[PDB]
Ligand binder design. Structure first.
Ligand SMILES: O=C(CC(=O)C(F)(F)F)c1ccc([N+](=O)[O-])cc1
Ligand SMILES: O=C(CC(=O)C(F)(F)F)c1ccc([N+](=O)[O-])cc1
Ligand SMILES: [Cl-]
Ligand SMILES: [Cl-]
Ligand SMILES: [Cl-]
Lengths: 143, 146, 144, 141, 145, 140
């Protein structure tokens, strides 16, 4: 809606350095969808180990980035449960298509499928220059 | 029937700190299986951010650890392709049951399902346990050789 | 009884990258403590000790033992509402075998003497890896 | 000639956590260079500048531009087979806007004189100037 | 008349790994400040600048002086209850000698002009290693924010 | 000038970041003694953890700092044994007198006692004041 910067992401997510993988939330509509973006700089602690010969953002950290963007969605959609500590329950149908490299802007959109009580299921996609880098059919989450 | 120590691991996998998650390979049968373990300590760089109120090993790092073990199996199963930089192509059927906490040993088995010299296309299943109970299942991991 | 990592941080002030007790698996107040440290290649100190070969620094096997000793002192007698304990002295440290990534360091400390509200405690300590003695400490002295 | 990071580390000696150029998009030898720095929350410095509010250190934006300058000098003339370039002096540094996480800092350095070399530099975030550096002086050593 | 690291943390918001003042050995309000930064090989920036040879970044030397300047400003006049000082501009920076591991970066910053009205302060800065000048800075402009 | 700078220390000791704790050797007499200094800054990875509430250099890191200085000594005393990885075999008579804080210069001296298993003694000063005593360090 209005844009929501980092200082306010740290108020929603319990995550911190080196494991906060969302820089900005550019569009969020509660109970439907969220769009955020992660900047990929060589100046991140994980590159030095993946890999020294060739820096490629771990596929698992692109899941984690989406999974955190998905989290921001759930915790703004309903905060009657005042517990920001969400855990990944299950993930299904992850497909990585293109490497994500330093200097790239990872643009990510996750979409809610169902909510209950928590037990929430979301879909996720990430793009670098309008090309699909990673698909996630279903991310499940629990309190 | 040898245990493989860390220095030899670092000769197989191109992974370094802070993203190498195999501490030891304790069992490995080429073209078939692999069993190793990751030691979970409070003194790993990720636990400060996940989370400061409660320390829990990020389930994706478990995926990575299993993937890295799977990775080991592939490269000691067939290294005509002298390229160690493997990339995750897809993961499927991931269920996390139990939290992995500091002090735990994460024992991991991954099983090769299919391998094709075609492109470096290998499919693998995997389980992660802490104290004989299942903490993670992975139905299918797909990897591509560069 | 059984002290998990979250409860460890409530007792000790130690934080990353210098908190070297992952679990306390047996404790008896004013007598003994058994805890454990998981040695993984994913610790910041391994990159610098050493690149060619990874061996857990001997001084960190002391500190770990010293932190587990501290825990015992603080649970044994907490009339002194001060958690910041300082190393006073250490005596008769012998390293026998290397501690490597993949290893579980089993540690036990035994309280020898405590002088109440003077903060002067003395303890012994032994660390194990697969039933094998990897570090011995004759005497750790602490100041509250 | 566009340059990715792997090749950047072949030109610059800078490494983690003090390599502040992620890509080189345009490079004209002896004339101009344009590159970008991705400002993400997952950088080591942000934890300390500041806890309460995250703002890229102005000194690092200079540094980012400085290395951008450094590459340009090296790919202009490398009969000096010495990649170690030192900051000899900086002038006319003006910070207009803070740089925050999630920003793309775009950078253009211009060579002025090479004998010892002199360069100007500008940094953009969404077409808007966030930093001006009139003169960066460098000494090969 | 010397303020140690715990107190520096009460004045400055800067934290690890971007706090670059270890001690303030002399400070006179509205006029001058003298402090020192200890250069150790066990600093996280050394690994990247550079692997082949360890040299404390010219830019960080700026930061350290600026930070020392920062302290001076905050203890000169604290009616503006705001410790987040931002660098507005820096002028006439000349680096003379490399600062190496093992060196004690002794620093002096001197206030020139302050307009309480706005939140704008101007300071010169000098750094010495063994009484030898390593860094000159003619002007460091700051904005209270 | 009897000194050793960091770039030369790194050729003698294998140790690297974040566990190299000797910034400079200032004096060295083979088979007798060695003087070195470690700079203690707030910009060191360990201070964030020990402690957050009050920054004090771990007693153990003062041992290691003196140990590494003692390690440089044995290696330059006699490098017929072409092996730089020295292991601390034991340590005895460690007493810590004063807290070492950020801002301090840790001035260390180690002295060779016996070489066959090498034994050495160690002292650390902070502004002439004695902060650490090590009766005996054993090396293998
Ligand atoms: O998970 C990994 C790293 C591995 O190869 C392994 F084996 F460690 F899992 C990864 C997967 C996909 C990409 N990608 O395409 O961006 C990058 C890295
Ligand atoms: O403190 C060290 C590191 C060193 O080698 C040196 F040189 F730094 F002292 C150490 C001490 C004891 C063992 N051990 O248990 O065998 C291994 C390493
Ligand atoms: Cl302690
Ligand atoms: Cl530079
Ligand atoms: Cl500042």
């Amino acid at each position: 809606d209005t844009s929501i910067d980092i200082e306010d992401i740290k108020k929603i997510l319990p995550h911190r350095y080196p494991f906060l993988l969302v820089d900005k939330v550019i569009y969020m509509q509660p109970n439907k969808t969220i769009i955020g973006l992660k900047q990929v700089s060589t100046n991140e602690p994980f590159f030095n180990g993946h890999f020294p010969q060739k820096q490629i953002m771990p596929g698992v950290l692109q899941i984690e980035a989406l999974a955190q963007l998905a989290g921001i969605l759930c915790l703004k959609s309903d905060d009657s449960q005042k517990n920001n500590l969400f855990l990944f329950a299950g993930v299904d149908g992850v497909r990585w298509k293109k490497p994500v490299l330093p200097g790239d802007t990872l643009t990510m959109q996750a979409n809610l499928i169902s909510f209950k009580s928590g037990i929430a299921k979301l879909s996720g996609v990430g793009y670098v220059n309008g090309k699909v880098v990673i698909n996630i059919s279903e991310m499940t989450f629990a309190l």
